[PDB]
């Protein structure tokens, strides 16, 4: 079975049967019961379970009202009718959620990946990270699908990595879908396309930044 779930506004009153013979439990998920009150003599024993919750036994034969107070300031009321049977467990819920905790992105990318991403972003804006002094670009970097002519514009060189910018010419007249891995050359770390690719048309000049290792041949 599954605990019976009851949703109540603060001060809410729910009529639930309990058991005279066996221990009964009431837990509020995410909350710790701090107090319990019942008419006198009605509840024989009250103990706090692990992770909140109350375990309680009743020798009573009369319907009674129990008030339970949680640590987050919520108070609920229950009307309990004692009846023969198995100990009953109830899950207490709050009708209105008090607050919405903001989501937490815990995932962390790899160091190499973040390094390339940071540089690509810096180049896209144009601000230079320290240790990048600018350099002549090569012609080695770009393989051309066809109809493309490459001219180097700007390039940065640093202590570990190197970036450069080449502008491809407009292709002929057939639409040329642009594949970011179709401009690959051994030795290149990352290649990214400015704007959104998605087929340069019967023409268009698009600047492409190519990232390659530094020092290593």
């Amino acid at each position: 079975q599954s605990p019976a779930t009851i949703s109540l506004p603060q001060g809410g009153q729910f009529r639930l049967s309990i058991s005279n013979t066996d221990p009964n439990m009431i837990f509020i998920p995410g909350d710790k019961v701090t107090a319990i009150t019942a008419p006198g003599g009605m509840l024989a024993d009250k103990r706090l379970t692990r992770a909140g919750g109350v375990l309680f036994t009743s020798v009573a034969t009369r319907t009674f009202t129990i008030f339970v107070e949680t640590a987050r300031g919520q108070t609920f009321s229950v009307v309990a009718t004692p009846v023969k049977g198995e100990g009953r467990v109830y899950r207490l819920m709050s009708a209105e959620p008090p607050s919405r905790p903001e989501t937490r992105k815990w995932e962390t990318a790899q160091a190499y990946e973040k390094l390339l991403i940071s540089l690509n972003r810096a180049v896209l804006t144009g601000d230079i990270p320290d240790g990048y002094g600018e350099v002549k670009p090569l012609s080695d970097g770009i393989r051309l699908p066809g109809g493309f002519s490459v001219t180097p514009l700007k390039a940065w060189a640093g202590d570990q990595l190197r970036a450069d910018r080449y502008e491809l010419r407009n292709a002929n007249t057939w639409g040329v879908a642009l594949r970011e891995q179709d401009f690959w050359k051994p030795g290149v770390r990352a290649v990214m396309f400015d704007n959104n690719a998605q087929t340069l048309m019967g023409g268009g000049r698009m600047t492409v930044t190519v990232i390659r290792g530094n020092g290593e041949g």
Binding site: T34, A35, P39, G40, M42, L48
Partner: peptide, 11 residues
């Protein structure tokens, strides 16, 4: 005695 109420506060 009648009318009184038992209440326990958990540490």
């Amino acid at each position: 005695r009648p009318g009184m109420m038992d209440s326990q506060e958990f540490s």
